[PDB]
Amino acid sequence: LISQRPTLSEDVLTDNRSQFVIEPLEPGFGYTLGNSLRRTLLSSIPGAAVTSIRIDGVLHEFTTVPGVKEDVTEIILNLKSLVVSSEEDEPVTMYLRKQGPGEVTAGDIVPPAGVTVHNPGMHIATLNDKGKLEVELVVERGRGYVPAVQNRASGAEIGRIPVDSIYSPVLKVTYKVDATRVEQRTDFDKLILDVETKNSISPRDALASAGKTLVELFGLARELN
Amino acid sequence: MLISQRPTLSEDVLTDNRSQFVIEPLEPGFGYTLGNSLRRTLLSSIPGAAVTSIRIDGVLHEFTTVPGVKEDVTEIILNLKSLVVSSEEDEPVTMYLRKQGPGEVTAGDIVPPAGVTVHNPGMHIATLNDKGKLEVELVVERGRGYVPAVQNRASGAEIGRIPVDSIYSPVLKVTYKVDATRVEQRTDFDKLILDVETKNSISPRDALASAGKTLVELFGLARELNVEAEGIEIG
Amino acid sequence: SSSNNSVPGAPNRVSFAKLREPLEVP
Amino acid sequence: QETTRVLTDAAINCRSDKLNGLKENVIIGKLIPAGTGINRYRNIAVQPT
Amino acid sequence: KLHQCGLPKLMALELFKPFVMKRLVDLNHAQNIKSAKRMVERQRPQVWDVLEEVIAEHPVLLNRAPTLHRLGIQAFEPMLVEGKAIQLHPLVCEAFNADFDGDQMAVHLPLSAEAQAEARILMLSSNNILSPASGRPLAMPRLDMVTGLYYLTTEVPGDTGEYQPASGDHPETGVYSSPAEAIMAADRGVLSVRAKIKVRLTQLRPPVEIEAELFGHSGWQPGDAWMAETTLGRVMFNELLPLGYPFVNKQMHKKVQAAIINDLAERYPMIVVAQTVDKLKDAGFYWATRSGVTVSMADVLVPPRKKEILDHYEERADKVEKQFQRGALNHDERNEALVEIWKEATDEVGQALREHYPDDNPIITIVDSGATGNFTQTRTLAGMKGLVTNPKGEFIPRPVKSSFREGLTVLEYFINTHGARKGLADTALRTADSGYLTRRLVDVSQDVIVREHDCQTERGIVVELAERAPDGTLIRDPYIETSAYARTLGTDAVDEAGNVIVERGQDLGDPEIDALLAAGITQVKVRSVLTCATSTGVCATCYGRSMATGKLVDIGEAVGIVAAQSIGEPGTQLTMRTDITGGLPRVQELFEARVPRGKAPIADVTGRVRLEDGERFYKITIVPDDGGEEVVYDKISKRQRLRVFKRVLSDGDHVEVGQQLMEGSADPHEVLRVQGPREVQIHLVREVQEVYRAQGVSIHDKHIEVIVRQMLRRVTIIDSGSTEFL
Amino acid sequence: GYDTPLGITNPPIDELLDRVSSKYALVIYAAKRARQINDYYNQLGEGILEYVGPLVEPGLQEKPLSIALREIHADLLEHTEG
Amino acid sequence: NPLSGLTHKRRLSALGPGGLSRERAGLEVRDVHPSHYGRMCPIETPEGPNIGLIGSLSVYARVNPFGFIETPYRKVVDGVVSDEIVYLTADEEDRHVVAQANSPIDADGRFVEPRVLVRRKAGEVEYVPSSEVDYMDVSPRQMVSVATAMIPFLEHDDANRALMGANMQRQAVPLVRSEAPLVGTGMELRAAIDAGDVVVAEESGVIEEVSADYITVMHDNGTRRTYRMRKFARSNHGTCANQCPIVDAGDRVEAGQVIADGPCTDDGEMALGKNLLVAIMPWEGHNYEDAIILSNRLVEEDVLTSIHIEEHEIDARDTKLGAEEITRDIPNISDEVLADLDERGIVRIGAEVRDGDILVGKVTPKGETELTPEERLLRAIFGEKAREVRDTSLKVPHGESGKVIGIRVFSREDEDELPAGVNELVRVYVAQKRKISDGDKLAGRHGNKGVIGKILPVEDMPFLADGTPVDIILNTHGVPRRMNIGQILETHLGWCAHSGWKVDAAKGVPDWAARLPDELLEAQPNAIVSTPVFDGAQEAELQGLLSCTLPNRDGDVLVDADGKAMLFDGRSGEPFPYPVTVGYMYIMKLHHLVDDKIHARSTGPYSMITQQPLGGKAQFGGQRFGEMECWAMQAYGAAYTLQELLTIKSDDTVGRVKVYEAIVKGENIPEPGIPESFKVLLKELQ
RNA sequence: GCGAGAGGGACACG
Ligand SMILES: [Mg+2]
Ligand SMILES: [Zn+2]
């Protein structure tokens, strides 16, 4: 009977991704645990993302703002890569204004206190001498994928453009087990998990949240007698 | 975040040692993420004890049959292997079996020293005839999982002792499935249905409790990085 | 000569062709 | 098939349909004389013991 | 589950609108019916709740046009499913002929209690496993399930965990105490699911031989224990079968599964068969995913010896062309020679590919598991396409010589397009023709329905049932599932005037045929629908077993429509022959009693024959033994060929009353006139069955017998007597 | 042996068949009994006639025909053929 | 899509006035005559009851002045394959002798081998020494049409599946992004610029201004031209027609350059669909028998989503009693529905609508009506109008919803051309961003059609060692028995293109790469390539390119030399015991979406002639229960269900109402009566 | 709330 409990060691490969190493897992409890954490990471790590935007010069998603090279739907698609981190659970609103020629990027937003944009270098659109963009985005906390909330579902005005929301800080999770499996039967697994997030939260926070979700979930099994 | 619907856990007894646990309504797809983990922990995380090696008097090279017994060596090894034992000492304890004369021999003949116990004395092992004598020494130890027959690494430590496959785990068979209960109103919450079957040593409820304990330990190893985290809470 | 060359803004779509085409498509 | 010929010669013969076939009872919307439609079962009476 | 079908909520709400209206009006959710109507039309949330409440235990009929046969429409238990597609159980696909590449299906809702009872009892999918045509199962696993089960139950020698019996140094290290221990060892990477092990099973009936060897008479298996050399795949499979079914221990080819499900259908209640089929489906899918069967460029192996044989046969073709250019033969003969040598070459290439391919290759495994495809498609895929047909039907003698893996050239592809487009157009026209034939049969035989349990008529047709062999043996007649099976004996069977073997009125199933063959008797007099004496319809006993249910037919069965649909289903699937017609048109002209386009006159009297071999015409005369007259013949071109028997009709040969003098298709009218209704009935049945077996389609004869009975109801009148008759 | 059936397959049909002669008989048997049950429920408030509404423990909102078929399973009915 | 528009033109319909019809069409006129080579594609054709009758011109074919279909040919003289193209009709073609397109000329017009495959007079194919050859095909793919020329590895597919792929390439809906194919053909670009929708500069110049609506180019000499973009225009079949610029203010553009894209074009070239990661294993039977299982990413990231614009129409006309008017004032209806309507009827731009919502508030004179006698005398005293009207407004059909794009109003007051008797005519456009859902039809280019059985979450999908989930999983049993093994080769070459490659030219070059063109021994990731139709990547080249498949980011080859990969199961966690074939496949979104197919009826309009329910999805309509279905019911023996389906569900005009009332009240179903259609038959016989 | 025309989907290769 191997009397050794497992541990957890972090290895910071880069800023946005890192490898955690849990060992020694019980023979056969390798791939299993890795997948049980992969699912949790890709599914239930709460985050923030833009829920609905409003542009003064348009009323729906299928038109064009004057001047801008892209069309409202292209701007929606480009504003689907905006990674944010809101603190206040309630909905918040942040504005954006640009006049004259130039490249409108994610760095030109004016988020209120608490919330912020973590990739100023993204290209949102391009304007010209006639360009004028005035867009207010709404950010709400949530988890997973929820499609756009309908205008008539709420009391939204005509100018509202609901946008489907994908709150998921994690970006890519994988794993691999290196089991010694020596002939002396003192065998064990060595789960090397690799987690990469989209700059919203470091992989430490995502894995901690997954562990919290799982510890709380399995309370029912332990909480029986 | 508040789940808004706490999963429950109910059971339906099938036999004295068997159960069909139901967990409902788990989130989508929180039926496979934990079903396989619970299955693996049940199978190979609940400590137990069992035989590891045996030496039989009268047989040293002829590993087929044994004198004075109507059975053969394979039959004896099969019978001993499916024998339930509970122990507390970590080092390999040794046990003795000896029956002289004709008749039949069960799991009640093996004398257990202090600490080791047998939960099924009435289990036929072999039979003897023509004033036959059977004398067999067993090695029993505690552990986890299912260790195959350990190769005799020592050249001559146990000339008369042969190793054997060993079933340490208390739970013999676990299966699981999921469903799509209440697709519309409840947005397709999964219903994990575990079917667990265990040795007498423990009821399946206790096995699930131990599986939950070890699972919470392993998954809290992840939780002990950023305690002020955010995640799903049943509340 | 890989790629369809007689179009100005052609993306450089490298081709496996072994036989040259004497006649461009009408 | 051959609606004109059969219909007109039936008219000349003044022939009468008995309405006891399987396709004849489907046109007029009656229980087909087969399966659950035959009188052996259509008229079965059931009452508690 | 096999009795369930998904149903989108958007469809269930509209179908069940009045029901949900009533249910929610009862629940105060809407004050009056009009308010309920507005609520459901706007789809307020609680509606969904009530919808489920009503939809539970309420069958709905699913149908897919064309409704070729009875199983086209089946009753399923609905349930709400997200999305907008009717989720259909896979095992019913073969019944509907439904594939999921864009099909659509229609859902009807029975209303009255009679309609609901009919949907639940008569038409429920779990109650319709066997086809109504020949009794073979249609709810069995197919394609992915068959591949998964074949991978599961196949045994691979030299695999990890194998039972090695070496002794002296250590035990066998292959035995396992229980399937629980073996699955535990398989979850760990020790024991492969397809490794020869020895388990100690205690909840599965042993094979019959082991049953007699160990227990003898009445070993009650769930408690006892017995050793079994097997593979854990087979052990896991046998847990899917019912408890009492003996351990099978065979590689689960599709035919083996067919035999197993036939045995289950015959010997067990339909509910058990449905549950076993569902569990087989689940295991088949699960182990098809793990089977690792994938198709890749690397796994489509090419035969290494292609070049040498291609050069050999190209040299032979060059020689044939060379001697053609020297005038050795005409163009027809040289086209024949090229076609022959290239057919031989393609057959050889197929053989070489077959011998070169490994055993566990994905393509060879898929074809050899019975799941899909035939080896010709693999030969074309790797090997060579072979000969290709011109639009007229002749063979292009080139031929194509590049496999689809190697890639055809421009002209070879162009040549292939001929056959492809020809096949498609033929398919459409044949579909139309077979539809017309089905309509005609259904309209000529609908009024044949069972009416009496038994007419007690002593008459009955005869069935050959494994004729004698020249050396002297009982070689089973190949086509027995259609003729002898599922019929009731008209007279008892005896051997050497000994004890009775099978009494009159026996079902005559497979055990019964084995008893017959063991006793040595060959011929059996069995009742049929031809001899049934009932005034209206047919008596139940004469008809025999109902193929679907498996028991004797009911008193209300519409056997006529069942027979018509059975004969019209394999239509759209008969190919013609490359003159004696032998395709669907042959069936059409045979069932229409047409004068055959290739009549082969049969004699009308026995005795020696004066042959007069006619040139551009013919002439035959049979010396009558009544001596009445040697009925003379002429106008028969010098094209037909004297039929071959015992020998081919020779000068002075002793002919019979129906010896086909020449070759061709005899006429039912003349053979009726000359022999009688018995012989014309047997002639019609034999020809229709032969045509349907040219394509290898199995139809039980009793459907053809129903149609042929409906042919010969009427008699012509020669003398009116004195009663109103023309 | 018959494993626990569910939904529309319960009670097992093959056990019902022994309580009748042919499948068609079971159809009409159950349908007429279901009409009786629905009629009891529908007009229970007033002076019910010879309709003997449910005989086996009815479900909370068991559909009439289901109660009927279960009754036939428990040998709680009799029939006279046409 | 542009391909369908291009292919409808160039189509050759063998039926019409002065030509044979389908019933008159036999089974020899539909074949592929040997004279179709180079003049009519033998692959592309409808597969319904139109096979052979409807075809398409080959790529190089040109029509003679008289009407015959010519074909270019390279005349060979003295054994030298000159470049003197000459156009021949069928008569000249079969008069002379023609060699195959792919013959090994020795870089000077002389063949290598004596025997070359030659087409003789009467369509025969034989081998002839290189002395009698008189003409040569200009190039391979001279036989195929434009639609079929876009199928990569066509010479490995079968004629049936090639035909299906060619037919299905004309059905893809235009997506929102329209990524170009990783593996394609040289025909995409030409087929795109000739389709017409790709906006092209006629004369060179320098870009002056760019915006979503216009692209203003400055030419070399004085003249400026503002190309007007076509944004969100409804095509004839309901799809979108967006054009987006692909140039900036500083670019200079040569004459004939692609200035802007169309619906399905990506920087000039045709893009009918998207490249998704494909695995070729049978996954848990959800992808069973042509069913395909996608990943939720395709829904999350809008990989496969299309904008569909539906058009609704209503006209106010002069009625017998007066005129029809459209106003916000409407007979009794809750006021909330008027919230979306503007002051003058038609709804406001950008307003979401659903089934049953009002699009055009319309009323018509109710008819002659009777006042109560006291009301009538009081109204005569008033002189008041009846003010009756009856509300009949444009409401969307069931199962329709989405934003409102445009309201186009036509009135006689504005001096427009309207049909006589119509005062007002207003069009409303309603768009919906249809995602990909269960049952929507997806198909590659080689005839691998299939509906979407299930859309698994991203987490429970097979993922490579890198952790990238497979976007779609195709069954493996559908490949071998259809002889369309180009989907596998397309998969392999797609992986090679996505991951790039670099042939090790350290010791010369590998033998298999001897004939490989230069600047193919290396290729960066996402390096689009092209395999022409009948001259493209060989099997040996594919094996070689898979041998060198340079690692993505770490030291790791996800897909080994066999084209297969080690896949980790998404649910069980453990890897699949054998490697799986993974790659990138170009699959498309066919226009057979479920939302257009699902239908349900319980009560609707009825035919007045015979009182059967109406038919079709446009109206409510009920599914036909034909003769064959009734035969099946009779076979079962279900008399009562047949009576139900034929009597009180369809024609018992006195019975349908009773059935509705009985079900609503919960009573027993009434007994059926006599169908009205039988009464109609009786009256007609009389 | 019918008719004609056109296009299109689904339909056994042993
Ligand atoms: Mg289909
Ligand atoms: Zn009879």
UniProtKB/TrEMBL annotation, chain F:
Mind telling me which GO cellular component terms the entry cites?
A: DNA-directed RNA polymerase complex
Which residues of the parent protein does this chain contain?
28 to 109 of 110
GO MF term set: DNA binding; DNA-directed RNA polymerase activity
Q: Subunit structure of this entry?
A: The RNAP catalytic core consists of 2 alpha, 1 beta, 1 beta' and 1 omega subunit. When a sigma factor is associated with the core the holoenzyme is formed, which can initiate transcription.
Q: Among its keywords, does the record have Transcription?
A: yes
Q: Name one GO biological process term.
A: DNA-templated transcription
The main enzyme category here is: transferase
Stated EC number for the protein is 2.7.7.6
Q: Which reaction equation describes what this protein catalyses?
A: RNA(n) + a ribonucleoside 5'-triphosphate = RNA(n+1) + diphosphate
Keyword flag Transcription? yes
Keywords for the protein's UniProt record, in alphabetical order:
DNA-directed RNA polymerase, Nucleotidyltransferase, Transcription, Transferase
Role summary:
Promotes RNA polymerase assembly. Latches the N- and C-terminal regions of the beta' subunit thereby facilitating its interaction with the beta and alpha subunits.
Q: Which family does it belong to?
A: Belongs to the RNA polymerase subunit omega family.
Query: What is the protein's given name?
Result: DNA-directed RNA polymerase subunit omega
